[PDB]
Amino acid sequence: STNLVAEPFAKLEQDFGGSIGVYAMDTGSGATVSYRAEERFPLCSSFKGFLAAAVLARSQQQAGLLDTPIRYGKNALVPWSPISEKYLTTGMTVAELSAAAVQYSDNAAANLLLKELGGPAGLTAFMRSIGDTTFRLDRWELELNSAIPGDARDTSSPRAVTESLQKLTLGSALAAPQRQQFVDWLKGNTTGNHRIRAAVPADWAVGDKTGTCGVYGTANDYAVVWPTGRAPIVLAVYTRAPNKDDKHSEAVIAAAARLALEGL
Numbered sequence: 001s002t003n004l005v006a007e008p009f010a011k012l013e014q015d016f017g018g019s020i021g022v023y024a025m026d027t028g029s030g031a032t033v034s035y036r037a038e039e040r041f042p043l044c045s046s047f048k049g050f051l052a053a054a055v056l057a058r059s060q061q062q063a064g065l066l067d068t069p070i071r072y073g074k075n076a077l078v079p080w081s082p083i084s085e086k087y088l089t090t091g092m093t094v095a096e097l098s099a100a101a102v103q104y105s106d107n108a109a110a111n112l113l114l115k116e117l118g119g120p121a122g123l124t125a126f127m128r129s130i131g132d133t134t135f136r137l138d139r140w141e142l143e144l145n146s147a148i149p150g151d152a153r154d155t156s157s158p159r160a161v162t163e164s165l166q167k168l169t170l171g172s173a174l175a176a177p178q179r180q181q182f183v184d185w186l187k188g189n190t191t192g193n194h195r196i197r198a199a200v201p202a203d204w205a206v207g208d209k210t211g212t213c214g215v216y217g218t219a220n221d222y223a224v225v226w227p228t229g230r231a232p233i234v235l236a237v238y239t240r241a242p243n244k245d246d247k248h249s250e251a252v253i254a255a256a257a258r259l260a261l262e263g264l
């Protein structure tokens with residue numbers, strides 16, 4: 001992957017102070033936009049979209065997996081588990097946990113689903129099984145957020161994220177009802193309004209999944225976008241920075257998303 005008009009991205013990256021990673025594809029034309037698309041970035045919570053897809057895939061083999069109630073304990077509630085905490089007294093179904101992991105980035109819900117799938121290794125295996133050789137999840141929440149420069153644990157590349165997303169939302173990796181459910185969950189995300197969605201015209205339908213590690217200026221978003229009358233665009237925007245105290249920027253993510261959409 002390459003880009004012979006990369007200077008707008010390079011200047012945005014210089015102004016940001018860190019590294020920016022972008023990959024976008026127009027699935028109707030095949031056109032792509034690329035910038036550090038092959039470089040590893042921390043997933044942060046963006047793994048949760050793929051976790052929900054892996055749960056949907058499994059549900060194709062075990063009838064009733066999605067409606068299975070989980071009565072989890074208080075000590076499942078690691079920080080930033082707003083849905084899991086609200087529903088602690090009732091428990092939650094696997095489907096509800098998946099939705100909360102996607103749409104609220106709920107940490108406890110993510111850890112409970114990971115356990116159901118055999119931990120980070122289990123999710124990584126699912127991703128290998130759809131042909132993603134870049135993705136790796138190694139740790140649970142919250143340890144996977146350490147985002148240490150050059151550490152390959154819990155990382156992927158913008159291109160591999162985009163390709164896997166396209167397979168799961170638009171290709172054949174998931175059966176049709178599962179596929180629609182994944183898309184529906186993404187379209188209902190609540191955490192993404194200042195990221196890719198901020199660059200998308202308000203009349204284009206969008207589903208997305210954010211990630212925010214909290215250190216090293218590391219944050220991200222991926223999305224499927226439906227332009228009017230066209231096949232969808234799929235894209236991924238990841239950031240990191242070299243100092244632990246560096247701030248992430250939602251505005252940088254939005255700006256990089258817009259440069260990608262404009263290039264297409």
Ligand SMILES: C[C@H](CS)C(=O)N[C@@H](Cc1ccccc1)B(O)O
Nearest residue numbers: 044045080105142145211212213214
């Ligand atoms: C440690 C860090 C929050 S400071 C964290 O748990 N991030 C996950 C979800 C998240 C994002 C923004 C605020 C709180 C939680 B995720 O893995 O991105």
